[PDB]
Design a protein around this ligand. Sequence first.
Ligand code: ADP
Lengths: 78, 415, 116
Amino acid sequence: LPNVYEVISKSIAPSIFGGTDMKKAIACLLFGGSRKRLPDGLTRRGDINLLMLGDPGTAKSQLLKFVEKCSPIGVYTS
Amino acid sequence: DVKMITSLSKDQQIGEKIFASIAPSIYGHEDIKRGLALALFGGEPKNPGGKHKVRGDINVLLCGDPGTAKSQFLKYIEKVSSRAIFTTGQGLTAYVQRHPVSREWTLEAGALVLADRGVCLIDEFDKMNDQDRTSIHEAMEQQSISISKAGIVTSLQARCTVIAAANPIGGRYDPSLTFSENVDLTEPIISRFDILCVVRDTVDPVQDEMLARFVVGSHVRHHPSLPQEVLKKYIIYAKERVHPKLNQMDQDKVAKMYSDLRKESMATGSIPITVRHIESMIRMAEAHARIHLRDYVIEDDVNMAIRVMLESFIDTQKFSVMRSMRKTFARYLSFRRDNNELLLFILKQLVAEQVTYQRNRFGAQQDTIEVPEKDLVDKARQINIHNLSAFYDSELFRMNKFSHDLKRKMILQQF
Amino acid sequence: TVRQLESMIRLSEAMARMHCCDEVQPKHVKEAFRLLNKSIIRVETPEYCRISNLIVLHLRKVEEEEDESALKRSELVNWYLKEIESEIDSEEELINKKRIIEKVIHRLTHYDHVLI
DNA sequence: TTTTTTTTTTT
Ligand SMILES: Nc1ncnc2c1ncn2[C@@H]1O[C@H](COP(=O)(O)OP(=O)(O)O)[C@@H](O)[C@H]1O
């Protein structure tokens, strides 16, 4: 469907609202790139990393819990 | 058996009459008496229909300088409660043990599974070990333990309310820093507690006699030359025959406070009331359904719930913020309190500070402190009561060893 | 603290046992207090005079600002010369006091107590 | 397959 991008990034953080970029990016980490093996066996990454800097205002713990819950495999650690 | 309890609960004023039934000896602390009474009966462990598993246990965490009857508050709750256990922090989970008789290597119960429905009294919370710390937090927000030990892989149940008391670092709690500094505890652990009472101390002349006389007298009648009957049967009864309900008239009475206070706290160096405080407030909502048999949420005990949930937050604050937030809210929330205690709050300080003056120049621990009147109504103008004679008649300040003179204006303080 | 009190009745009882009596009298408690009084000593420092005038001012500076606006920095300094210089008289001691007051008031800065 | 005491390598 034409607007396939935003339909997901809209329904991945119902409670917390504001600045969908911090929700735009999280949409990709759930899919990830692809693992390549060059002729040299020198494989490449297939995952991404994200940092959400800022004061601890508990607005982010919700997001952590969500991304952990809606993941094929996932663990939230202190 | 209930026919008395009917009218005794219908007194409409069972709160005061029950508060001074726990802590039978220890004088003062009608503040923390309130919180611990809230904890004892508990609240309501409702099951949210969205599969979120909110808990119905009130956990308390005392703290304060040594010598303030914390341990006695633990030991008396050992007695009054039922199915209670006890431990120090200097055995928390089930462990493999070679049986004395059978001589088989069985599994024995720890100290958080023996309170699977009652209370768990932790002492010397600070002295816990890293394994003990990583094991205590799991049971707070999950209330269920797994044991993949040498014995066998099991997953048991643990539904207990935790009552513990930590210590201040440096041998004294000093309220320049936040409470999260003098406690010496991992930060995501303090969040797992509902109430945060801070015990403190001060050299106060009029209370020296009050505490001395009490101890001395308790040493006069112990040597070889609501009573304890109503409230035990009452924690047995009121535990059972109530199931508090939840309407939706209070659902908007609170947000008007949150929207303000969140800004008020975030403005300065602090984190405002967050959802894990709203949960505690809504848990203590029903904490009075057990005392009144009320069981219906009303805009009355919401004045109490919000009051308590801020009581346990203004204290754990900074030096000038613990008073700036007071000047805002303690006057904002319209504390459903005595009009008289707010009178004492003034002249108590006005005589204590005057003694502090008359010590740093003379040094003599004088006998009769003398303070003229005019100062008091100056500050009473801020709360707008200006009532002294109806307080002069009230015997709620003679015990505090004060006086007044119509022609001399002196608030003469004896001791 | 409190635990010193529960430890004064004990010493009086142990004093009464000694004289084979069956009750405590003032004669016993007075001595059981003198002993517990000599027990605790006073900490020392190479300075008590320089702390009297640390809190004789911040009792003249907290109540004076929470109601009115503030105080003059060139007048609160003299208030000390305007309360305690009113009795002792030596015409030299004025500036000898002013110099130490200026030094200590520059000192109050690094404790972060009396700032301007 | 448990305490308690004593020596030495290791995080
Ligand atoms: N207000 C008080 N009323 C009665 N007893 C008190 C009071 N304050 C202190 N005590 C005494 O202090 C003891 C409690 O000390 P505790 O709080 O256990 O010290 P710590 O906290 O260092 O373990 C009690 O046995 C009690 O006799």
